[PDB]
Design an enzyme around this catalytic site. Structure first.
Site, PDB file in Angstrom:
ATOM      1  N   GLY A  79       0.808  -1.209   0.000  1.00 57.32           N
ATOM      2  CA  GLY A  79       0.000   0.000   0.000  1.00 57.32           C
ATOM      3  C   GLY A  79       0.844   1.263   0.000  1.00 57.32           C
ATOM      4  N   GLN A 157       4.478  -8.785  -5.484  1.00 53.00           N
ATOM      5  CA  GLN A 157       3.132  -8.828  -6.034  1.00 53.00           C
ATOM      6  C   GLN A 157       3.201  -8.858  -7.557  1.00 53.00           C
ATOM      7  OE1 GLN A 157       0.806  -5.224  -5.599  1.00 53.00           O
ATOM      8  NE2 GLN A 157      -0.955  -6.349  -4.755  1.00 53.00           N
ATOM      9  N   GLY A 215       0.236  -4.473   6.697  1.00 57.46           N
ATOM     10  CA  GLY A 215       1.332  -3.741   7.304  1.00 57.46           C
ATOM     11  C   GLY A 215       0.917  -2.508   8.081  1.00 57.46           C
ATOM     12  N   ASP A 216      -0.223  -1.904   7.746  1.00 58.87           N
ATOM     13  CA  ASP A 216      -0.723  -0.744   8.472  1.00 58.87           C
ATOM     14  C   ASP A 216      -1.586  -1.114   9.668  1.00 58.87           C
ATOM     15  OD1 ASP A 216      -3.076  -1.621   7.339  1.00 58.87           O
ATOM     16  OD2 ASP A 216      -3.244   0.034   5.899  1.00 58.87           O
ATOM     17  N   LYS A 375      -5.921   4.378   8.120  1.00 64.74           N
ATOM     18  CA  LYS A 375      -6.310   4.771   6.775  1.00 64.74           C
ATOM     19  C   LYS A 375      -6.619   6.254   6.656  1.00 64.74           C
ATOM     20  CE  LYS A 375     -10.168   4.830   5.128  1.00 64.74           C
ATOM     21  NZ  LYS A 375     -11.298   4.474   4.224  1.00 64.74           N
TER      22      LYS A 375
END
Length: 483
Positions: A79, A157, A215-216, A375
């Site tokens: 991200g 990815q 990861g966040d 977020k």
């Protein structure tokens, strides 16, 4: 196999680009799925709700550390911060003490490496946009991770071609060929592990479990009680779920379905009950009220997942080197900005949809402290304030003066939805939200230093003349502050 022109085009495209073979296989199966006329709809008439699940809150037994010797922490790193205005990787944002998400995860992984199990392994799911700065960060801060970043840590990815909506041919966009490709969603995670041979390698070296998480998500840490539960109950795919609140009624939910299974030689069995999840892209219109019933479908997927690696490899080898997951068709255009670009499909999969793929899969209700995804700028405001504290195993917890409720951060969109504008608000200091129920800020403002916020506050700069820097050494309980 005989395949259509558009599928052969996708194949040649992906081959010319050196896309590895597992990604081609998975994608072409999806492509046939789209062309056949599969709607991808999960109607209420084919699902049951989940009545009750075990609660991590009610688990006590922790596994041995020898289990932790066969464990891989995989952290979703792909991200960017594009929501909060950053073309930089989201895990490299400061969250506390000048440390970032990656700081905290690596300090946790080496704390467990030195106190519990030396052979705990660590991996990052990188995109092409996050790889370079991630490698630089680990090179600068955690040398032992940079030493093996290419061979052991970073799994990459892969990306799949956008296909045109009419002919399902691979879309073509000359002004920037980059827009001709997209990521396949987090659910890609299984085609990479398999497609790189890295799953085979982990399984060969005797690894048993993998803890996947975003990861966040700073609250998604190793819990040994979960591993123990997986040994006791012989589970192969555990998904951590949270009780769905009315703020979450927009997002997806977990559900129950039945599936006729036949035993092929000699014929002895019937229908089995297996867990699935659905998002709103799988729910029809006529059923969208059933989707948003908090008490009908009570649980949502946190994206904390525990997988038993050799079972993953076994079932991926049953299905021809592939884990075929429900397909979400994204209606887009090739240039996501250019509303006159060729309309296209972006085929994605969710990594939680794999729960339906396993014969022994379960979900376990966990506290919302294990689902705290940053977020919004409001998030890392709550996290940068002393409302959270860092323990000696380098996990972040709520302080006890909060009583389980974290503070509510109600930042204004006008001035604080971007990072570069968020720096100004907390450029002087970060206020003390240790005993604050709500912080509201509707206008241009910046805090002072040593500010204490208690109870419910609301700061206004209605006039908007100039930054209403709040007085230094302030102490506002239940207090409103205008000029």
């Amino acid at each position: 196999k005989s395949l259509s022109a558009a599928a052969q085009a996708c194949v040649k495209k992906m081959r010319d680009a050196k896309v590895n073979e597992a990604c081609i296989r998975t994608f072409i199966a999806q492509h046939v799925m789209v062309s056949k006329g599969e709607t991808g709809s999960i109607p209420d008439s084919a699902i049951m709700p989940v009545d009750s699940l075990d609660a991590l809150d009610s688990l006590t037994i922790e596994c041995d550390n020898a289990v932790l010797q066969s464990t891989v922490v995989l952290k979703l790193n792909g991200g960017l911060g594009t929501g909060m205005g950053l073309c930089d990787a989201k895990t490299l944002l400061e969250v506390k003490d000048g440390k970032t998400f990656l700081d905290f995860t690596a300090l946790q992984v080496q704390y467990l490496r030195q106190h519990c199990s030396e052979h705990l392994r660590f991996m990052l799911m990188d995109s092409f946009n996050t790889s370079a700065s991630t490698k630089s960060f680990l090179k600068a801060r955690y040398p032992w991770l940079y030493q093996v970043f290419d061979s052991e840590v970073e799994l990459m990815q892969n990306q799949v071609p956008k296909i045109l909506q009419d002919t399902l041919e691979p879309a073509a966009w000359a002004e920037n060929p980059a827009y001709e490709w997209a990521p396949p969603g987090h659910g890609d995670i299984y085609t990479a592990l398999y497609g790189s041979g890295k799953l085979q390698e982990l399984v060969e070296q005797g690894y048993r479990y993998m803890f996947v998480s975003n990861g966040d998500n700073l609250g998604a840490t190793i819990d040994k009680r979960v591993l123990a539960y997986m040994e006791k109950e012989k589970i192969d795919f555990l998904m951590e779920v949270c009780r769905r609140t009315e703020s979450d009624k927009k997002g997806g939910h977990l559900a129950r379905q039945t599936v006729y299974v036949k035993g092929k030689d000699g014929q002895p069995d019937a229908e089995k009950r297996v867990l699935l999840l659905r998002e709103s892209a799988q729910c029809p219109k006529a059923d969208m009220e059933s989707f948003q019933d908090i008490n009908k479908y009570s649980f949502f997927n946190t994206n904390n997942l525990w997988i038993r690696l050799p079972v993953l490899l076994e079932t991926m080898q049953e299905h021809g080197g592939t884990l075929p997951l429900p397909v979400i068709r994204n209606e887009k255009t090739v240039d996501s900005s250019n509303s006159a670009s060729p309309k296209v499909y972006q085929l994605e999969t969710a990594m939680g949809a794999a729960i339906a793929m396993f014969e022994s899969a379960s979900a376990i209700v966990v506290p919302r402290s294990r689902f705290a995804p940053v977020k919004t700028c409001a998030d890392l405001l709550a996290l940068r304030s002393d409302a959270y504290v860092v323990t000696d195993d380098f996990r972040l917890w709520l302080d006890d003066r909060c009583h389980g409720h974290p503070p509510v951060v109600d930042l204004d969109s006008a001035h604080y939805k971007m990072m570069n504008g968020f720096e100004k608000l907390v450029q002087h200091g970060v206020p003390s939200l240790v005993e604050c129920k709500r912080v509201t800020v509707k206008g241009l403002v910046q805090f002072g230093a040593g500010n204490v916020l208690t109870g419910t506050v609301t700061i206004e700069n209605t006039d908007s003349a100039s930054a209403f820097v709040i007085p230094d050494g302030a102490k506002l309980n239940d207090t409103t502050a205008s000029p």
